[PDB]
Amino acid sequence: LTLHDLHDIFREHPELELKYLNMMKMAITGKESICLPFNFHSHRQHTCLDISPYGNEQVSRIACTSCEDLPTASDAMVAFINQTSNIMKNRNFYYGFCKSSELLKLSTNQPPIFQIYYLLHAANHDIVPFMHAEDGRLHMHVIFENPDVHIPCDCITQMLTAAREDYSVTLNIVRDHVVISVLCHAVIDVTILQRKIDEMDIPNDVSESFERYKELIQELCQ
Amino acid sequence: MNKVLHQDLVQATRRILKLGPSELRVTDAGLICKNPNYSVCDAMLKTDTVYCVEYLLSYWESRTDHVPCFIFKNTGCAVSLCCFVRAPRHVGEFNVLKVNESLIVTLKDIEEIKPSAYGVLTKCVVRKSNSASVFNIELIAFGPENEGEYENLLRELYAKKA
Numbered sequence A: 001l002t003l004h005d006l007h008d009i010f011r012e013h014p015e016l017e018l019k020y021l022n023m024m025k026m027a028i029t030g031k032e033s034i035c036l037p038f039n040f041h042s043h044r045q046h047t048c049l050d051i052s053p054y055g056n057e058q059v060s061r062i063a064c065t066s067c068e069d070l071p072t073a074s075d076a077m078v079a080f081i082n083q084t085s086n087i088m089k090n091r092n093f094y095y096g097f098c099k100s101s102e103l104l105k106l107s108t109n110q111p112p113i114f115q116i117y118y119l120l121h122a123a124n125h126d127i128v129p130f131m132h133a134e135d136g137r138l139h140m141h142v143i144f145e146n147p148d149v150h151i152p153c154d155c156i157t158q159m160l161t162a163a164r165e166d167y168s169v170t171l172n173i174v175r176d177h178v179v180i181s182v183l184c185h186a187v188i189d190v191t192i193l194q195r196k197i198d199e200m201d202i203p204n205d206v207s208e209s210f211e212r213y214k215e216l217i218q219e220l221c222q
Numbered sequence B: 001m002n003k004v005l006h007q008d009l010v011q012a013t014r015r016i017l018k019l020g021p022s023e024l025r026v027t028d029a030g031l032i033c034k035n036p037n038y039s040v041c042d043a044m045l046k047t048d049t050v051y052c053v054e055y056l057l058s059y060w061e062s063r064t065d066h067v068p069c070f071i072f073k074n075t076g077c078a079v080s081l082c083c084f085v086r087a088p089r090h091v092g093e094f095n096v097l098k099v100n101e102s103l104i105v106t107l108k109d110i111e112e113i114k115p116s117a118y119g120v121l122t123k124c125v126v127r128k129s130n131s132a133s134v135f136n137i138e139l140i141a142f143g144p145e146n147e148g149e150y151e152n153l154l155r156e157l158y159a160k161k162a
């Protein structure tokens, strides 16, 4: 039977049409592969990103079978303001400055860096940020410890929102790691931060990351 | 082309696309008998809204016995779907549509996109693009939630046809 036939039957049987169109609700297309490096600005809306050994895939959220049925750009703002209170919880962020006062200062005049971290961190705890500057402008590279990386559509549209058209956001695989690079093209209580972060220790487990990631880091600075 | 056919196709376009009375422009029935290169009606497409485009195409064909042709247009800050009975750049799975550009969809085009012929209904969504007044048009094929439900309903529908 064809759709042609269905219409002829539905004209007499509106009860059956209802039931029919209600069952046709499972996406069987939506998934497509993509090329690394992947520019998030040049992407399809309401698509997740699935990166695994098996494939690098954009997939319409309607078609996604990983994310069940969150944190906003505006939400990450309010963590930004209160980072002062969540320092040991965000010790992974600050390890990223490598005990620099100057970079840590720069991230006080660049909220999207904290936000984009905050947004990715909500999605994935297993990340290692690292920061550096070129011409007073702070950059961040988010290294994923694992080869299986799912980036929900909601996290993406919101990273893009937080970045305005100031920053480039990019996903690539560099020296066997998925890395999201956040490259700044343009640009409040510094004092207690500088102190608490200067006072906070960096543990030997974390220093091993940065050691193992040294050439990866050298390669990401350009 | 005639009056009641015209009424039929206009009403069905409202029903199938779930349009408000505000969202459909109708060419005069008297005009379109004589000029088939004009559209029967044109629908305003809201962004982020699933529209049953294959279903609508097949509806038209079943009543005209003519291969229909609908055209997506980026009119500048809106997408419209212009519905033609006959025809006078065609759709793929995803499509960029800039100001002034057109994208033709026919049943033949839907056919080439979709992965299998049976148990598959193709719909579409318009998305507002990152920058500029540019829209993306996704075509997405849908199957049954449950294949049992669907085999059943067909058997029932086979039984109805007389």
Ligand SMILES: [Zn+2]
Binding pocket: A048, A049, A061, A064, A065, A066, A067, A150, A151, A152, A153
């Ligand atoms: Zn997802």
